[PDB]
Design a protein around this motif. Structure first.
Motif, PDB file in Angstrom:
ATOM      1  N   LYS A 123     -11.164 -10.253   9.857  1.00 33.55           N
ATOM      2  CA  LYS A 123      -9.837  -9.670  10.381  1.00 33.55           C
ATOM      3  C   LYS A 123      -9.720  -8.350  10.917  1.00 33.55           C
ATOM      4  CE  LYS A 123      -5.842  -8.793   8.332  1.00 33.55           C
ATOM      5  NZ  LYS A 123      -4.971  -8.802   7.334  1.00 33.55           N
ATOM      6  N   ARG A 124     -10.334  -7.362  10.116  1.00 33.04           N
ATOM      7  CA  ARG A 124     -10.167  -5.947  10.478  1.00 33.04           C
ATOM      8  C   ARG A 124     -11.409  -5.748  11.473  1.00 33.04           C
ATOM      9  NH1 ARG A 124     -10.891  -2.567   6.135  1.00 33.04           N
ATOM     10  NH2 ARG A 124     -11.426  -3.929   4.425  1.00 33.04           N
ATOM     11  N   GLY A 180       1.925   0.334  10.391  1.00 28.92           N
ATOM     12  CA  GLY A 180       1.561  -0.610   9.764  1.00 28.92           C
ATOM     13  C   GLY A 180       0.093  -1.009  10.291  1.00 28.92           C
ATOM     14  N   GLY A 181      -0.619  -1.276   9.215  1.00 31.07           N
ATOM     15  CA  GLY A 181      -2.153  -1.846   9.677  1.00 31.07           C
ATOM     16  C   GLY A 181      -2.303  -2.998  10.486  1.00 31.07           C
ATOM     17  N   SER A 182      -1.426  -3.890  10.400  1.00 31.06           N
ATOM     18  CA  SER A 182      -1.640  -4.925  11.335  1.00 31.06           C
ATOM     19  C   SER A 182      -1.342  -4.844  12.900  1.00 31.06           C
ATOM     20  CB  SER A 182      -0.573  -6.183  10.830  1.00 31.06           C
ATOM     21  OG  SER A 182      -1.077  -6.304   9.651  1.00 31.06           O
ATOM     22  N   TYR A 199       0.982  -1.188  -0.137  1.00 26.00           N
ATOM     23  CA  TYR A 199       0.044   0.068  -0.055  1.00 26.00           C
ATOM     24  C   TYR A 199       0.922   1.302   0.018  1.00 26.00           C
ATOM     25  CZ  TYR A 199      -4.428  -2.204   0.796  1.00 26.00           C
ATOM     26  OH  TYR A 199      -5.523  -3.221   0.583  1.00 26.00           O
ATOM     27  N   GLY A 259       3.247  -4.574   8.561  1.00 28.25           N
ATOM     28  CA  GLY A 259       2.476  -4.227   7.314  1.00 28.25           C
ATOM     29  C   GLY A 259       1.683  -5.578   6.541  1.00 28.25           C
ATOM     30  N   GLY A 260       1.381  -5.401   5.250  1.00 31.92           N
ATOM     31  CA  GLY A 260       0.495  -6.478   4.748  1.00 31.92           C
ATOM     32  C   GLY A 260       1.436  -7.634   4.328  1.00 31.92           C
ATOM     33  N   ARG A 269      -2.789  -2.808  14.674  1.00 30.29           N
ATOM     34  CA  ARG A 269      -4.070  -2.341  15.133  1.00 30.29           C
ATOM     35  C   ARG A 269      -4.667  -3.802  15.781  1.00 30.29           C
ATOM     36  NH1 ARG A 269      -5.782   0.524   9.947  1.00 30.29           N
ATOM     37  NH2 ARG A 269      -5.737   2.748  10.455  1.00 30.29           N
ATOM     38  N   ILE A 270      -4.056  -4.965  15.578  1.00 30.73           N
ATOM     39  CA  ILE A 270      -4.644  -6.137  16.106  1.00 30.73           C
ATOM     40  C   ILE A 270      -4.250  -6.146  17.742  1.00 30.73           C
ATOM     41  CG2 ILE A 270      -4.279  -8.637  16.242  1.00 30.73           C
ATOM     42  CD1 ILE A 270      -3.485  -8.431  13.210  1.00 30.73           C
ATOM     43  N   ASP A 284      -1.205   2.806   9.436  1.00 36.03           N
ATOM     44  CA  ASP A 284      -0.866   2.679   8.236  1.00 36.03           C
ATOM     45  C   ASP A 284      -0.634   4.276   7.542  1.00 36.03           C
ATOM     46  OD1 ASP A 284      -3.617   3.217   8.518  1.00 36.03           O
ATOM     47  OD2 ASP A 284      -4.316   1.621   7.293  1.00 36.03           O
ATOM     48  N   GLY A 316       0.303  -9.019   7.532  1.00 36.84           N
ATOM     49  CA  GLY A 316      -1.072  -9.244   7.434  1.00 36.84           C
ATOM     50  C   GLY A 316      -1.754 -10.112   6.719  1.00 36.84           C
ATOM     51  N   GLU A 317      -1.098 -10.795   5.342  1.00 39.98           N
ATOM     52  CA  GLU A 317      -1.803 -11.650   4.465  1.00 39.98           C
ATOM     53  C   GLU A 317      -1.413 -13.006   4.946  1.00 39.98           C
ATOM     54  OE1 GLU A 317       1.105 -12.918   0.824  1.00 39.98           O
ATOM     55  OE2 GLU A 317       0.603 -10.781   0.653  1.00 39.98           O
ATOM     56  N   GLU A 347      -9.973 -11.230   5.214  1.00 42.00           N
ATOM     57  CA  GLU A 347      -9.293  -9.996   5.301  1.00 42.00           C
ATOM     58  C   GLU A 347     -10.496  -8.820   6.017  1.00 42.00           C
ATOM     59  OE1 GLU A 347      -7.591  -5.972   4.549  1.00 42.00           O
ATOM     60  OE2 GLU A 347      -9.371  -6.578   3.628  1.00 42.00           O
TER      61      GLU A 347
HETATM   62  N1  LIG Z   1      -8.318  -2.655  11.755  1.00 42.17           N
HETATM   63  C1  LIG Z   1      -7.086  -3.678  11.310  1.00 42.17           C
HETATM   64  N2  LIG Z   1      -7.011  -4.849  11.794  1.00 42.17           N
HETATM   65  C2  LIG Z   1      -6.116  -5.670  11.193  1.00 42.17           C
HETATM   66  N3  LIG Z   1      -5.341  -5.708  10.195  1.00 42.17           N
HETATM   67  C3  LIG Z   1      -5.494  -4.343   9.721  1.00 42.17           C
HETATM   68  C4  LIG Z   1      -6.376  -3.648   9.976  1.00 42.17           C
HETATM   69  N4  LIG Z   1      -6.447  -2.445   9.264  1.00 42.17           N
HETATM   70  C5  LIG Z   1      -5.592  -2.790   8.489  1.00 42.17           C
HETATM   71 CL1  LIG Z   1      -5.282  -1.690   7.211  1.00 42.17          CL
HETATM   72  N5  LIG Z   1      -5.158  -3.850   8.653  1.00 42.17           N
HETATM   73  C6  LIG Z   1      -4.140  -4.641   7.656  1.00 42.17           C
HETATM   74  O1  LIG Z   1      -2.740  -3.921   7.559  1.00 42.17           O
HETATM   75  C7  LIG Z   1      -2.150  -4.361   6.200  1.00 42.17           C
HETATM   76  C8  LIG Z   1      -2.090  -2.888   5.693  1.00 42.17           C
HETATM   77  O2  LIG Z   1      -1.091  -2.249   6.174  1.00 42.17           O
HETATM   78  C9  LIG Z   1      -3.353  -5.321   5.672  1.00 42.17           C
HETATM   79  O3  LIG Z   1      -2.798  -6.622   5.837  1.00 42.17           O
HETATM   80  C10 LIG Z   1      -4.636  -4.839   6.056  1.00 42.17           C
HETATM   81  O4  LIG Z   1      -5.451  -6.201   6.266  1.00 42.17           O
END
Ligand SMILES: Nc1ncnc2c1nc(Cl)n2[C@@H]1O[C@H](CO)[C@@H](O)[C@H]1O
Length: 385
Positions: A271-272, A338-340, A15, A201-202, A342-343, A366, A230-231, A268
């Protein structure tokens, strides 16, 4: 006006994100689909070239002519073991042009080959057009970010991608340095500050240790897993749902490419949802042989499915601490990128490893790199006048 304007670009593996610092605040610019981040995908079709969300949306129908992961190829030689190992996993063709890799595709019915910097320049052109549509005037000055472990050849090929895209590259800065700038960690006055950047990240995981001494940044250590992101958590959800489909219907869906891809996109999304809810629902109409797949998953089951992967993120954190020759108590700040990140389980494991310490996570993880790049671009353009 335009000459006094500068943007910050986070040119990521999966991204990309663009920000601008104006009127005392950073604005992360949404694309024409309203997303603050854009996929780093370039699709070559029978009629057009697609970039971003539109390219990612048709990846199932056109896998051989949809390029992604160009950042894994940039500044590298064809013979590099990293390139040779990665090539075995991509659906697009990678060719050798004088020890330099080129991506070979079909575009408007003809065979065309592109250098990774040409592919990255198309993503950069899209980011530039997103900023131009938001500002109302063309902006050409930019700060572009790179991983802290990128060598001189990778940094030069990124600057060249910026030149091809029509950008005046003010500076190529490290991603963990942009993240620390976003949190104002270079404005704490006198004294050496030790910062740990946890970047999940992803498709990649990076741990960076920085020392900030009187505004001057120094990279002490870099550690990580170039093939963890994340993938991998999405695929763990996919495998779970394939086995659940098999238990309820006595039917294997794993070979049906369309069923697996629809399951993957839904996993995906779920998971978010699990990052802010304790349960998520999957609602897939006619998944396989006319059978609807309407189920749910708790955050607890999701954490069990990815448990080994989450725990594996602490080995590079320990490795970066030993390379930097610092103990945990010597780290002043912990930054999430990175978005991951947030987990909730990821944050709990990192906070417990640092003895209950508070994490810097108020800036969208992110978006933190583009945020800091936008701050640096504003400072750099002002000094240029
Ligand atoms: N709320 C979330 N909870 C978990 N994973 C997240 C979340 N948001 C994103 Cl973006 N990602 C992931 O971050 C990556 C991009 O930076 C992707 O794998 C996306 O699914």
């Amino acid at each position: 006006m335009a000459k006094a304007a500068a943007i910050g670009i986070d040119l990521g593996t999966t991204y990309s994100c663009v920000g601008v610092f104006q009127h005392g605040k950073v604005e992360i610019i949404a694309n024409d689909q309203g997303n603050r981040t854009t996929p780093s995908y370039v699709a070559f079709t029978d009629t057009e070239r697609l970039i971003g969300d539109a390219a990612k949306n048709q990846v199932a129908l056109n896998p051989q002519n949809t390029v992604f992961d160009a950042k894994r190829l940039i500044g590298r030689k064809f013979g590099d073991p990293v390139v040779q190992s990665d090539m075995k996993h991509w659906p697009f063709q990678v060719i050798n042009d004088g020890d330099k890799p080129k991506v070979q595709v079909s575009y408007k019915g003809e065979t065309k080959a592109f250098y990774p910097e040409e592919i990255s320049s198309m993503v950069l052109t899209k980011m530039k057009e997103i900023a131009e549509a938001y500002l109302g005037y063309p902006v050409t000055n930019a700060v572009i970010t790179v991983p802290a472990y990128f060598n001189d050849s990778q940094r030069q090929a990124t600057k060249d991608a910026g030149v091809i895209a029509g950008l005046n590259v003010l500076r190529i800065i490290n991603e963990p340095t942009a993240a620390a700038i976003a949190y104002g960690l270079d404005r704490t006055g006198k004294g050496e500050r030790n910062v740990l950047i946890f970047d999940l990240g992803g498709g990649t995981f990076d741990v960076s240790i920085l020392t900030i001494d009187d505004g001057i940044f120094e990279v002490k250590a870099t550690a990580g897993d170039t093939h963890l992101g994340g993938e991998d958590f999405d695929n763990r959800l996919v495998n779970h749902f394939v086995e659940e489909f098999k238990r309820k219907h006595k039917k294997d869906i794993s070979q049906n490419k369309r069923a697996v891809r629809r399951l993957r996109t839904a996993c995906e999304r779920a998971k978010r949802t699990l990052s802010s809810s304790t349960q998520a629902s999957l609602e897939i109409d006619s998944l396989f042989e006319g059978i609807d797949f309407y189920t749910s998953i708790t955050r607890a089951r999701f954490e069990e499915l990815c448990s080994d992967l989450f725990r594996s993120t602490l080995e590079p954190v320990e490795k970066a601490l030993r390379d930097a020759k610092l103990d945990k108590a010597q780290i002043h700040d912990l930054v999430l990128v990175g978005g991951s990140t947030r987990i909730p389980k990821v944050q709990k494991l990192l906070q417990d490893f640092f003895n209950g310490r508070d994490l810097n996570k108020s800036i969208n993880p992110d978006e933190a790199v583009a945020y800091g790049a936008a701050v640096q671009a504003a400072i750099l353009i002002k000094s240029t006048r």
